[PDB]
Design a binder for these strands. Structure first.
Ligand SMILES: [Mg+2]
Ligand SMILES: [Zn+2]
Ligand SMILES: [Zn+2]
Lengths: 118, 29, 146, 183, 37, 150, 80, 140
RNA sequence: CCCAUAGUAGGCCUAAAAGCAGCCACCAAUUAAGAAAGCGUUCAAGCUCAACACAAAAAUCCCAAACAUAUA
RNA sequence: ACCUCGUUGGAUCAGGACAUCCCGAUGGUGCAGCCGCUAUUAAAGGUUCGUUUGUUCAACGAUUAAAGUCCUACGUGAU
């Protein structure tokens, strides 16, 4: 589900991924959103690549990384799977997801005037 | 290039200042 | 809450309106937030709190009507903006990149093509500075810029 | 003469002698026969052009029957051209008459921003208010450590970094610059 | 639009709006008053 | 400003002012006026019959003509602030007059009723309806005023 | 607009909405350009009727309503 | 629209003070001056007279006139032709309180001028203030 | 927010300059009132105020990766 | 505080900036259309040949949509 990552703040629009083809005029600067639309794996891949130590083991380590944009995973990889790590960020619930019992449990904070359009 | 003062640096300086104030007190008698 | 109904003839009927829950923890306070002891204990994701000050289509309600403080009205407005941009109010809408804690409207920020040197880095704002005084449960202060 | 009198570019008879920029000003720090003024929030040098533009911009939006403006700084005398030294806290131009502070606030702020050094448009009430709130700051600060205390006691051996003038300036005045927020 | 460091409404119909990240003075009656921060 | 020695910068940072912090927010914690008073007090006894209208939709010239036609009679038209008129009702003990004066209100104080001709004049302008008044401490609605006129 | 009739009972419980409505819209400042209208104010919960000679009658029970709502409704109906 | 003029009854056709100022709305100068001369005959001749002409949208004339001016009237009562320069110290003629009351008797009667105040004080104070602003001393 | 009747275009001169060319008093009606603090008219006319009322940059290619709330 | 005076282009190939000379998109205009002027955005592309001068330049001639301002150790002389 690397396609469904979430950036905090305006990083989708402000974070810029820079690359150079090596040729003159080959400098490319692409925002996080554009890079995500192009490759739904590049953002997580690049974050991991940057966090790994900058030595000759890094690309071997990246060979053990398997990124999949969606819920689909190849069968052999799925059979290899051993453990699932807890998600680092707990996803906040939407009102559409909250149960009526929870809404009732949460108190009403104020008395709205009856003669109000709202 | 400019340099900036961190909270850790401020805390270190404050620790030193507290030691010096206690030195003042113990030298006052 | 009065609602206008048409048939042309139009008339306004006052319907059922919710009331403040019984037994406020701190009665006789300025704002509902002070009355219920929530001065620095809500965030952008507390939709149950935030939606109580929201028009059915997502807009904020005026401070005069809500009774909120000026600072608390600003905090609620910004938290509601962040909740909307994070998609936590799917039903409070006028009629795909996941986000959260987005201070600015997505279409109004420019890409940071030239982040500065280390001493003058252009940082990406995260969250809102209005919530800077919230309760701190972490050893390090939460960063407003990334 | 309810107007800013023209000042000579240079004194007729040069004077031999009698850093005039660093530190607080000692003279003309208080209102004298005026109600509003321009206060210098930092030291600097006033040129003849600066004086001429002061006079022009003051006498332009001027009501001689209701406003009278006077200088507090003498004519450019220090040779370099001739200039006048000004220290922080020195009043530059004073005003008085049957008038209210907002009547002059606009162009006083404009001319203060015109001034080469930091400057402010200050009434008698505003000057008293800022002095009183500065006293309140230095009386109610919750910091146990003050520049004055540390410098005087030579805590941390800080006088190796500080100046002898820092002991008297108490950290508020650093060079020609003045830091009113600095308690 | 005219680029101004400080935005000043000129007539009554000049209104300040923060759009696309920056402040503007728009005006229906006098488009000459259009200002951009 | 030239760069300070870093030790001096640390000193300034450590000696920065710290404002006192209250535990609980105080915010979130708990002669024209007398001239009008005396003039309205005197008027309440001077007038015998009183009426009120909403003379605001009229132009300057139309209001001037209306004032001229009223001054043709002994009736005098008045405008006074509701902000100060609300205390006047309870001061003069006019309880039924509270739900009568809100927004624009123009009094028509008089002692001789030319209300027949005033209503006739108002008829040619199909707006500005008559509002209930209270003659000599006796409230009269619009129907009561019409009956009194007839 | 062809005709408009405004009725209210300030003798009974007051309704400032229709009062402000008639003070603002039922003014010659508007009628100067809206000369085609004939306004009548018959005072005795309230009721604002508007007759258009073409096909329309608009009845406003402006008891719970307010001045802004009724002005906007009137403008929308005028636009038609 | 209302057009305000302070023309003298003697010279009914001074020229520029009437022609261009009235021709913008569309007027008949012949009829206007004829009615002005009719009012001049109805009243004393050779004295400035304020007018209250209202040019109706139907292009018709309704000239309204009343008492003469106040400045010239006071100057004539004091035997003065040209007003004083300073008007704070200069004086040429003195008018007694009895004369002020006598001239005020026939003053609070016009409709357009709005001098309709019932009390004598409301008019006497205004005329005394006007005389004081002019170069006339109020005796006793 | 709302709009501002009128003694009188207040007079001196100023072709007229009336509130806007200038100086002199700066009164007065209703209830509320500047012989006007600012636009525009040769001058008027038209408009507001007040009064009632309710900040920045540059040249080979941006430059750790990233992160807002787990116990100090 | 007297006088004086203390490596450079060109050719070739160009890389880059945008503070845009032209081409693109807009706002305003004391522009009715044509236009001009001004401002925002835009660096993908383009940006001439000659006479005198060693000219670094400059002037002139003829053009051009335009004949941009610069940085690159004259950018570049083991070409
Ligand atoms: Mg550009
Ligand atoms: Zn405008
Ligand atoms: Zn509160």
């Amino acid at each position: 589900n690397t396609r469904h990552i979430a950036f905090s703040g305006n990083k989708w629009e402000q974070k810029v991924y820079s690359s150079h083809t090596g040729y003159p005029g080959g400098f490319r600067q692409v925002t996080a959103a554009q890079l995500h639309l192009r490759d739904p794996v590049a953002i997580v891949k690049l974050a991991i690549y940057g966090m790994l130590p900058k030595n000759l083991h890094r690309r071997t380590m990246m060979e053990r990384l398997h990124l999949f944009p969606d819920e689909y995973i190849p069968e052999d990889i799925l059979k290899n799977l051993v453990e699932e790590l807890p998600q680092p960020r707990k996803i906040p619930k939407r009102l559409d997801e909250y149960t009526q019992e929870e809404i009732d449990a949460f108190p009403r904070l104020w008395t709205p005037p009856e003669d109000y359009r709202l | 290039r400019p340099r900036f003062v961190s909270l850790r640096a401020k805390q270190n300086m404050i620790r030193r200042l507290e030691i010096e104030a206690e030195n003042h007190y113990w030298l006052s008698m | 809450f009065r609602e206008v109904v048409e048939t042309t003839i139009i008339e306004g009927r006052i319907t059922a309106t919710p009331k403040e829950s019984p037994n406020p923890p701190n009665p006789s306070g300025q704002c509902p937030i002070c009355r219920w002891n929530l001065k620095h204990k809500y965030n952008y994701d507390d939709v149950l709190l935030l939606s109580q000050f929201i028009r059915p289509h997502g807009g904020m309600l005026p401070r005069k009507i809500t009774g909120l403080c000026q600072e608390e009205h600003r905090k609620i407005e910004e938290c509601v903006k962040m909740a909307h941009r994070a998609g936590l109010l799917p039903n409070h809408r006028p009629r795909q990149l996941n986000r959260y804690l987005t201070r600015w409207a997505p279409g109004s920020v420019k890409p940071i093509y030239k982040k500065g040197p280390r001493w003058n880095r252009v940082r990406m704002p995260v969250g809102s500075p209005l919530l800077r005084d919230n309760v701190c449960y972490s050893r390090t202060p939460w960063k407003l810029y990334h | 003469k309810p107007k800013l009198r023209f000042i000579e570019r240079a004194p007729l008879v040069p004077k031999v002698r009698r850093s005039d920029i660093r530190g607080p000003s000692t003279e003309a720090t208080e209102f004298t026969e005026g109600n509003f003024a321009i206060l210098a929030l930092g030291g600097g040098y006033l040129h003849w052009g600066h004086f001429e533009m002061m006079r022009l911009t003051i006498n332009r939006s001027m009501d001689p029957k209701n406003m009278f403006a006077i200088w507090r700084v003498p004519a450019p005398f220090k040779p370099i051209h001739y200039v006048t030294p000004v220290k922080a806290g020195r009043l530059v131009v004073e005003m008085g008459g049957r008038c209210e502070f907002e009547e002059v606030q606009g162009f006083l702020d404009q001319v203060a921003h015109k001034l080469p050094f930091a400057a402010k448009a200050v009434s008698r009430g505003t000057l008293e208010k800022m002095r009183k709130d500065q006293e309140e700051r230095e009386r109610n600060n919750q910091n146990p450590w003050t520049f004055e205390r540390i410098a005087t006691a030579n805590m941390l051996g800080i006088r190796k970094v500080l100046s002898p003038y820092d002991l008297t300036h108490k950290g508020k005045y650093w060079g020609k610059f003045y830091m009113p927020k600095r308690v | 639009f005219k680029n101004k460091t400080v935005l000043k409404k000129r007539c009554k119909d000049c209104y300040l709006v923060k759009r696309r990240g920056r402040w503007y003075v728009y005006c229906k009656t006098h488009p000459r008053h259009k200002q951009r921060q | 400003r030239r760069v300070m020695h870093f030790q001096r910068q640390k000193l300034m940072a450590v000696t920065e002012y710290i404002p006192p912090k209250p535990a609980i927010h105080p915010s979130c914690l708990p002669g024209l006026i007398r001239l009008l008073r005396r003039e309205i007090a005197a008027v309440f006894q001077d007038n015998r019959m009183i009426a009120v209208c909403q003379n605001v939709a009229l132009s300057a010239e139309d209001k001037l003509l209306m004032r001229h036609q009223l001054r043709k009679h002994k009736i005098l038209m008045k405008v006074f602030p509701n902000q100060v008129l609300k205390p006047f009702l309870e001061d003069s003990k006019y309880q039924n007059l509270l739900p009568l004066f809100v927004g624009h209100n123009m009094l028509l104080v008089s002692e001789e009723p030319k209300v027949k001709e005033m209503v006739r004049i108002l008829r040619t302008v199909p707006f500005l309806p008559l509002l209930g008044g209270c003659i000599d401490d006796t409230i009269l609605s619009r129907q009561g005023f019409i009956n009194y006129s007839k | 607009v062809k005709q408009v009739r405004v009725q209210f009972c300030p003798f009974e419980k007051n309704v400032e909405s229709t009062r402000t409505f008639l003070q603002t819209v039922s003014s010659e400042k508007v009628r100067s350009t809206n000369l085609n209208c004939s306004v009548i104010a018959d005072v005795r919960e309230p009721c604002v009727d508007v007759l258009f000679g073409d096909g329309h009658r608009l009845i406003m029970r402006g008891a719970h309503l307010t001045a802004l709502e009724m002005l906007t409704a009137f403008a929308s109906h005028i636009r038609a | 629209g209302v057009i305000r003029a302070i023309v003298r009854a003697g010279l009914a056709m001074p020229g520029p003070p009437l022609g261009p100022v009235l021709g913008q709305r569309g007027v008949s100068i012949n009829q206007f001056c004829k009615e002005f001369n009719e009012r001049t005959k109805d009243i004393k001749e050779g004295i400035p007279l304020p007018t209250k002409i209202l040019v109706k949208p139907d292009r018709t004339f309704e000239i309204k006139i009343g008492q003469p001016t106040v400045s010239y009237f006071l100057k004539a009562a004091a035997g003065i032709e040209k007003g004083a320069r300073q008007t704070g110290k200069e004086v040429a003629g003195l008018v007694t309180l009895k004369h002020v009351y006598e001239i005020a008797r026939i003053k609070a009667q016009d409709e357009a001028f709005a001098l309709q105040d019932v009390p004598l004080s409301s008019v006497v104070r205004s005329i005394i203030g006007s005389a004081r602003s002019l170069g006339i001393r109020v005796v006793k």
